[PDB]
């Protein structure tokens, strides 16, 4: 899943790659190959490494489901993790199966 590319981790990577592409230090193909490696690596690290639970509540503003991918947008949300509160006015959630 090329799911985790638009994350802090994934975007910093792409930006770094584009530069190297811009200054012609690497080809786009090589950059693509690196991103592919990233997908496998982030996916693997998430399932095997992290292991905590989170909870959230809010009002659903919109939802969409196409290509088996859910995209939500919640308003006035409250993300709950044992050590308490994280409040946000708006949050977008993209979820693959």
């Amino acid at each position: 899943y090329q799911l985790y590319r638009n994350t802090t981790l994934g975007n910093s990577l792409q930006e770094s790659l584009d530069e190297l592409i811009q200054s012609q230090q690497i080809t786009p193909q090589l950059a693509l190959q690196v991103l592919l490696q990233f997908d496998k690596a982030i996916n693997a690290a998430l399932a095997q490494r992290v292991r905590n639970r989170v909870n959230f509540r809010g009002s659903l503003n919109t939802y969409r489901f196409c290509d088996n991918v859910w995209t939500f947008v919640l308003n006035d949300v409250e993300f709950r993790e044992v050590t308490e509160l994280i409040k946000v006015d708006k949050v977008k959630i993209v979820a693959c199966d």
Binding site: T62, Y63, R64, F65, C66, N68
Partner: protein, 180 residues
């Protein structure tokens, strides 16, 4: 009765008159679901009037959930306007209410077994299967679900009058089986 059946659900259909690219609609419209492998139509919802539409690639659409004829037509007009704004030349042909559901309370218990025994040609009642007695009225052609609690559901109507008429017909029959 000072008892008036309240409309609870209306299903209508309308023809937008042009083929629709459902993938486009599902990707660009808000509050839409599209899973062709399971259901061939896009399922879209709006909050006012609070209803759910089923939009087919043929251009025909089904509108559900509204509680009044006007809400049903308005809702369908909105769905059609959404599709219209995404770039399709939608029309609004042959809008038509297909089914209406009403409900009410006679405010007293009912002897169901008694009612089904004396109205064997219009009803059926199997408590183990479904706790409600099903009464198939001939005029108007309406199906009622009658519960011992006294709550009543009426469905199958094409127009509001059939709902009111069917309940006026059933009320005296039900009084005849009130629970002492």
């Amino acid at each position: 009765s000072g008892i008036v059946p309240q409309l609870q659900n209306i299903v209508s259909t309308v023809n937008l008159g042009c083929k629709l690219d459902l993938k486009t609609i599902a990707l660009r419209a808000r509050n839409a679901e599209y899973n062709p492998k399971r259901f061939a139509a896009v399922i879209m919802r709006i909050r006012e009037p609070r209803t759910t539409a089923l939009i087919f690639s043929s251009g025909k659409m089904v509108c559900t959930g509204a509680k009044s004829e006007e809400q049903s037509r308005l809702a369908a007009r909105k769905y059609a306007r959404v599709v219209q704004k995404l770039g399709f030349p939608a029309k609004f042909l042959d809008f038509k209410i297909q089914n209406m559901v009403g409900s009410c309370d006679v405010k007293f218990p009912i002897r169901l077994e008694g009612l089904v025994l004396t109205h064997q040609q219009f009803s059926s009642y199997e408590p183990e299967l479904f706790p409600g007695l099903i009464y198939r009225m001939i005029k108007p052609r309406i199906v009622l679900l009658i519960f011992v609690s006294g709550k009543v559901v009426l469905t199958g109507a094409k127009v509001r009058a059939e709902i009111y008429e069917a309940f006026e017909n059933i009320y005296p029959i039900l009084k005849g089986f009130r629970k002492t």
